[PDB]
Amino acid sequence: RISQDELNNVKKYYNMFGYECNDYSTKLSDITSMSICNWVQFKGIWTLPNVDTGHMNMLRALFEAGVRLWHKESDMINNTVVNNVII
Amino acid sequence: RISQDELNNVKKYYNMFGYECNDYSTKLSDITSMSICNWVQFKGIWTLPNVDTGHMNMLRALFEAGVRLWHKESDMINNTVVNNVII
Amino acid sequence: LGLNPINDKHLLRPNIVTAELTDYAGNRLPIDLSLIETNLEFDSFVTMG
Amino acid sequence: LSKIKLFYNTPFNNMQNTLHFNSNEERDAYFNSKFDVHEFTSTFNYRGVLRVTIDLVSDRSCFEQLMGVNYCQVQYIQSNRVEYLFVTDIQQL
Amino acid sequence: GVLRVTIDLVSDRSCFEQLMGVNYCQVQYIQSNRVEYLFVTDIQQLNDKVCELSLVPDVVMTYTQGNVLNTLNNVNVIRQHYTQTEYEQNLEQI
């Protein structure tokens, strides 16, 4: 095995950035799936109902680069990520 | 074989972006060929009868980078691509 | 392996854990631990006499 | 000088994905069957990338907030040739 | 983006610009009472009495709460986390 630390550094990486994916054309897996936070990153073409055309863009291209949607504030500033989990 | 999912991710890829081609000098295969949508990407030199010289350009260079010509609206926003097909 | 059985199955791959057999006489069996669906079960094909 | 028509919440928002009909009338027919708030008349200055100054004073709870627009049509009166445009942004004067 | 909110403070006693740990703000637009949050890039000091706030809107925060994201379809996803079920399916790949 790799070392106790390195093992964790890896655990963390997946916890923080989820999984490489190549599903051109699907629907996102539930955003509320994880327990601590929940990365989401995708590319056009989607429109959200009734939004400044240019906030969309700003929105589109924000996810194309990815957004870590946290699920509790505590965690946003605590060494918890390590324990993210699928319910 | 590769996995059920990977298999689909691949199916999709071809469905959405068609096929690598190197036919300097042909005529496009019918644009209405597929059932769900129909990628098309090609490089000068073509002129469309009677168009703003500078909309051509904008046009030319838009295809040189490629355009996915969808064929029904439903599909533009549904997990259908998966089932694109040659009639 | 000290993984958590519940949410760590995805770490069962060869840069995180590894597996090898040996008879201490220079016969070996290298095992890509990513290629077992669920279980590390060893059988044998033996003949005798 | 020309007859604008601004479509709301439409899928058409990247230049790499379009829809395709077998005749521009069917195109137009389609488009002319899905509207959602305003449809005026201007004579907009074209120089891409251009601007359409568009006024709304009969408001009650709006200001800028005629929002989901991205795509629009322009039937130029009167050669009645037609032309669609995306709308990059929306500034509030 | 990117805009500015001229904001005044004259009832001071030991301030000037020094209302300091601001980054995020809210705006309840009166009166459609729709709401919108923005980050604040910077904070320029025009004088002893009035400072300026540069803003850029947190489009994420503003527009994405609830179930919205999960109904979008035909999207090309690039990384996400998976529901137990969707994980098992992608397990070999990962």
Q: Chain C partners of A86 at a C-beta cutoff of 8 Å?
A: 7
Mutate to test the interface with B, among A21, A25, A27, A45 (most CBs of B within 10 A): A25
Beta-carbon contacts of residue A40 (< 8 Å; ≥ 6 apart): A18, A28, A31, A63, A66, A67, A69, E69, E77, E79, E80, E81
Distance CA E48, CA E51 (A): 8
The encoded tokens of residue B43 equal 């490089």
The three-class DSSP label of residue D26 is helix
D contacts of E34 (beta carbons < 8 Å): 65
Q: Which amino acid appears at position B43 of this protein?
A: K
Taking a contact as any Cβ pair under 8 Å apart, which residues of chain D between 9 and 68 contact chain E?
A: 61-63, 65
**Environment class of residue A60 by beta-carbon count within 10 Å: exposed (0-12), middle (13-18) or buried (19+)?**
buried
Q: Which residue of A has its CA nearest to C7?
A: A85
**CA max distance for chain D:** 42
- Is E91 part of the contact surface with chain C (CB cutoff 8 Å)? yes
A40/A30 Cα distance (integer angstroms)? 10
E47 Cβ contact list (under 8 Å, min separation 6): none
Give the span between the Cα atoms of E69 and D63, in whole angstroms: 28
CA dihedral C3, C6, C11, C17 (to 10 degrees): 30
b/e sequence A5-42, b meaning 16+ C-beta within 10 Å = eebeeebeebbeebbebebbbbbbbbbebbbbbbbbbb
Q: Which residues contact C18 (CB under 8 A, 6 or more apart)?
A: A1, C31, C33
Q: Which amino acid is at D16?
A: Q
Judge contact between D50 and D44, C-beta under 8 A: yes
Q: What is the resolution of this structure in A?
A: 3.0
- Is any Cβ of chain D less than 8 angstroms from the Cβ of B42? no
Judging contacts by C-beta atoms under 8 Å, the chain A residues touching residue B12 are: 23-25
Residues in chain D, overall count: 93
Which residues, other chains included, contact D11 with Cβ-Cβ below 8 Å and sequence gap of 6+? A45, A47, B73, B76, B77, D17, D19
Chains touching C by CB (3 or more pairs below 8 Å): A, E
- Going from the C-alpha of B67 to that of each of B61, B70, C22, E82, the distances in angstroms are 10, 9, 57, 31
Please check whether residue E70 is in contact with residue B73, taking contact to mean a CB–CB distance below 8 angstroms: no
Instruction: Kindly determine whether residue E74 and residue B81, on different chains, have CB atoms separated by under 8 Å.
Output: yes
Amino acid letter, E81: H
Q: Do E74 and B6 touch (CB under 8 A)?
A: no
C28 reaches E (C-beta below 8 A): no
Give contacts of C9 with chain E, Cβ < 8 Å.
Answer: 91
Q: Is residue B32 less than 8 Å (CB to CB) from chain D?
A: yes
Q: Do A39 and E87 touch (CB under 8 A)?
A: no
Dihedral sign for Cα atoms in the order B51, B57, B62, B63: positive
A16, C8, C20, E38 from C31: Cα distances, Å = 30, 19, 6, 53
| CA E74 – CA B75 distance, rounded (Å) | 8
The distance of C37 to chain E (nearest Cα, Å) reads 8
- Tell me if residue C22 falls in helix, strand or coil: strand
Coil/strand/helix, residue B16: helix
Residue in chain A closest to D71 (alpha carbons) equals: A53
| Residue from the list A1, A4, A14 with its beta carbon closest to the beta carbon of C17 | A1
D9 and A44: CB-CB below 8 Å? Answer: no
Q: Among the residues of D10-91, which ranges form H helices? A: 24-31
In a 13 Å sphere around the CA of D69, the CA atoms on its Cβ side amount to 24
A23 at the B interface (CB within 8 A)? yes
Nearest CA to A61 out of A50, A82, A46 is that of A46
Which helix (H) or strand (E) segment holds residue C29: the answer is: strand C28-31
Q: Which residues on adjacent β-strands are paired with residue E52?
A: E6, E44
Task: Answer whether the bond into residue A45 is a cis peptide, omega within 30°.
Answer: yes
The answer to whether the Cβ–Cβ distance between E90 and B80 falls below 8 Å is no
D71 min Cα distance to partner chain A (Å): 9
Say if the Cβ atoms of B71 and D16 lie within 8 Å.
Answer: no
* Per-position b or e across C11-32, b if 16+ CB within 10 A of its CB: bbeeebbeeeeeeeeeeeeeee
- Work out whether strand A39-43 and strand A67-68 pair parallel, antiparallel, or are unpaired: antiparallel
Alpha-carbon gap, residue A61 to A43, rounded angstroms: 7
Mutate which: B2, B10, B36, B82, vs A, most A CBs within 10 A: B82
